[PDB]
């Protein structure tokens, strides 16, 4: 099974977790279960407390102006632990009688694990401590709530505009990470206009809300074509564009997947359904002007094993 | 020369001196601490630059305080002449208007940042912040201009007084009204209205959501600002009624020093409620993780 554990300074507390990534199934969320191991005598006149909270970091400066704490909490849970599942019951037998299981549930309408590269974004954090209710007597863990590609392909994207006629339609909606996008553009160019270039770009829209709705216009991949269309001539061509985290570096605020500890993660997956960050992807085609937006969903496929906690090649 | 101009014409006074001394005692250390860290230690951001400029204004204002203390504590016998009263009044007006503008622009920036994030880190640039600071400083400079040109020093029954001298006949009445009304509009009406609208709209937006400490500090700052400048502006406006209509010139003989004391206390406590109270701030004067593994599991 290879359960994952993290200890605390001075060897006082230790928590065992079956997995660190929880999948949202659009109808239920994987329970955050586990077992905490405590020193045999460290709890005299004290009670162990395990807390799971959601942190939405939204700023980092050198001074709070009046009261702005630069960190808002969306969900707070607390467990004391002084029916068991099939995972934590096995941990009790392996550890002994000094282990106390803790059970946590993630309510619906909660943001996924998203991180903004410069760790700003939504993060899930677990604190385990004992007190009669410091960072050297508590266990700090970070977990990710992620969603994968659904089983419904969805309707075929299509969007048309006229001002010159432009038609674009992607083959499908569900695109895997790293999968190139095949888009077909058809133009008529009725009269009295001549397009100098063909521009196809992919931009990432992130819906961040804490007090008001905000939108992001962060292009990911941009493609430029030198083809020119003369009046009363039809032109059909299929372009290939694919988002990738190679030329998008050094772009502050880019939406990325949840980072555990200074790891490398790809672009944030599209959020499918609240206070948090909602990520959406669109494809923009411009003629040089008329603009056509083709929304699409970019999600990971359903895996057969727990994803790694870091990049497989280290250093 | 014998320029004598003789004619025929308290606990409330002592409390003003007490407030002056208390503000002087607390104001200088707090302003110095704010200057030292924001100017040199902390990183140079828009908020840091704005607070540094506000602290500079407050420091100069409290450094020219003791001249006013000597002026007020001896029944108005200003022993400095004509080349110092005008400069002191001009610098005090400059500092107070700069401080008011800095607080109102801080409120504007807070409202913009917490309500309109779509355009919050696009126009907010250190160069733009410097332009705004320069504009504020030159506005406060060429808004207290008549205070350096109108004041004159005369005799008041064996007491030398430097006063605005709003008589440089027909122009005497209009000039007195215009300056006081302009000061009221630009120092008490527009900034207070901006602070009220910006803060209340922030509260309404936050109320339609799910920090408690954020509201309390805003309310405390608002009430502290309101209760101090209000007596000063009301008494300044009341001066017009003396020349316009009949008056007794009795209530204004002692209310003005108390209003000035309240204003100075507000200036002293602005660092207290803005910089000198945040939780993160106190941490560094006190000064001045494990690795994730894995284990087995029986089947």
């Amino acid at each position: 099974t290879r359960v994952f554990k993290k200890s605390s300074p001075n060897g006082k507390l230790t928590v065992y977790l079956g997995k660190r990534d929880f999948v949202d199934h659009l109808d239920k969320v994987d329970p955050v279960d586990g077992v905490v191991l405590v020193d045999p005598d460290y709890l005299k006149d004290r009670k162990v407390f395990v807390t799971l909270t959601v942190a939405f970091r939204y700023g980092r400066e050198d001074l709070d102006v009046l009261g702005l704490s630069f960190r808002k909490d969306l969900f707070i849970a607390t467990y004391q632990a002084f029916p068991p599942t099939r995972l934590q019951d096995r941990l009790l037998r392996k550890l002994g009688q000094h282990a106390h299981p803790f059970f946590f549930t993630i309510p619906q309408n909660l943001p996924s694990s998203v991180t903004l590269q410069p760790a700003l974004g939504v993060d899930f954090e677990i604190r385990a401590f004992v007190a009669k209710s410091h960072k050297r007597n508590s266990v700090r863990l970070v977990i990710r709530k992620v969603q994968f590609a659904p089983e419904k392909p969805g309707p075929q994207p299509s969007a048309e505009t006229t001002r010159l006629h432009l038609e674009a339609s992607l083959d499908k909606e569900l695109y895997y990470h790293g999968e190139p996008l095949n888009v077909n553009v058809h133009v008529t160019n009725n009269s009295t206009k001549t397009v100098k270039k063909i521009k196809v770009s992919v931009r990432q829209y992130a819906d961040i809300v804490l007090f008001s709705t905000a939108q992001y216009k962060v292009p990911v991949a941009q493609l430029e074509q030198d083809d020119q269309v003369s009046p009363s001539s039809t032109f059909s061509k299929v372009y290939t564009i694919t988002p990738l985290l190679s030329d998008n570096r050094e772009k502050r605020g880019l939406a990325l997947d949840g980072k555990l500890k200074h790891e490398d993660t790809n672009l944030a997956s599209s959020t499918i359904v609240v206070l948090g960050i909602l990520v959406s992807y669109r494809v923009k085609v411009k003629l040089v002007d008329v603009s056509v937006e083709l929304p699409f969903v970019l999600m990971h496929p359903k895996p057969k094993e727990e994803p790694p906690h870091r990049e497989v090649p280290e250093n | 020369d014998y320029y004598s101009l003789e004619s025929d014409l308290g606990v409330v006074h002592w409390v003003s001196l007490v407030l002056y001394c208390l503000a002087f005692v607390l104001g200088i250390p707090g302003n110095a601490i704010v200057i030292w860290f924001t100017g040199f230690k902390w990183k140079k951001t828009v908020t840091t630059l704005w607070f540094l400029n506000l602290a500079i204004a407050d420091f100069i204002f409290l450094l020219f305080l003791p001249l006013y203390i000597s002026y007020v504590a001896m029944n108005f016998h200003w022993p400095f002449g004509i080349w110092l009263c005008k400069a002191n009044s001009f610098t005090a007006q400059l500092n107070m208007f700069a401080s008011v503008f800095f607080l109102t622009v801080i409120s504007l920036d807070h409202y913009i940042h917490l309500i309109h994030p779509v355009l919050s880190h696009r126009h907010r640039t250190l160069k733009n912040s410097l332009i705004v600071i320069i504009f504020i400083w030159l506005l406060a400079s060429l808004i207290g201009g008549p205070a350096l040109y109108f004041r004159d020093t005369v005799e008041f029954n064996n007491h030398t007084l430097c006063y605005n001298n709003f008589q440089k006949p027909d122009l005497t009445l209009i000039r007195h009204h215009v300056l006081t009304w302009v000061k009221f509009i630009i120092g008490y009406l527009f900034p207070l209205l901006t602070m009220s609208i910006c803060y209340l709209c922030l509260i309404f937006k936050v109320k339609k959501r799910s920090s408690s400490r954020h509201f309390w500090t805003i309310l405390v700052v608002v009430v502290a600002f309101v209760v101090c400048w209000t007596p000063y502006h009301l008494f300044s406006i009341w001066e017009l009624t003396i020349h316009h209509n009949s008056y007794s010139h009795h209530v204004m003989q002692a209310g003005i020093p108390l209003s000035t004391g309240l204003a100075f206390l507000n200036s002293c406590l602005n660092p207290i409620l803005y910089v000198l109270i945040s939780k993160k701030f106190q941490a560094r004067f006190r000064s001045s993780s494990c690795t994730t593994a894995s284990s087995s599991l029986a089947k």
Partner: nanobody
């Protein structure tokens, strides 16, 4: 870190952490299976041994010698390990025992 187990053919010496107000335990895995617990030792007063090794196995610790001596029919042939009761330190290696 630097978990250097000695004895056999039993003492463990740690470098990073300290034995101050912590409980240290010895783990014997199995002849051919996963890990198991043998005995523990708190700061002093409650030794709390196990049942199978009881009478047959003892334990001791010195807060100044920076070492833990475990003192010890044919089923005790495995690889012994010394670690914190909460299993905080990285798992080391034991030479042998028979």
């Amino acid at each position: 870190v630097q978990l250097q187990e000695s004895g056999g053919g039993l003492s463990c010496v740690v470098s990073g952490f300290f034995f101050d107000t912590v409980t240290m335990a010895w783990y014997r895995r199995a002849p051919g299976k996963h890990r198991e617990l043998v005995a523990s030792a708190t700061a002093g007063g409650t030794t709390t041994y196990a049942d199978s090794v009881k009478d047959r196995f003892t334990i001791s610790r010195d807060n100044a010698k920076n070492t833990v001596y475990l003192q010890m029919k044919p089923e005790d042939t495995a690889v012994y390990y010394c670690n914190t009761f909460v299993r905080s330190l990285s798992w080391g290696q034991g030479t042998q025992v028979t």
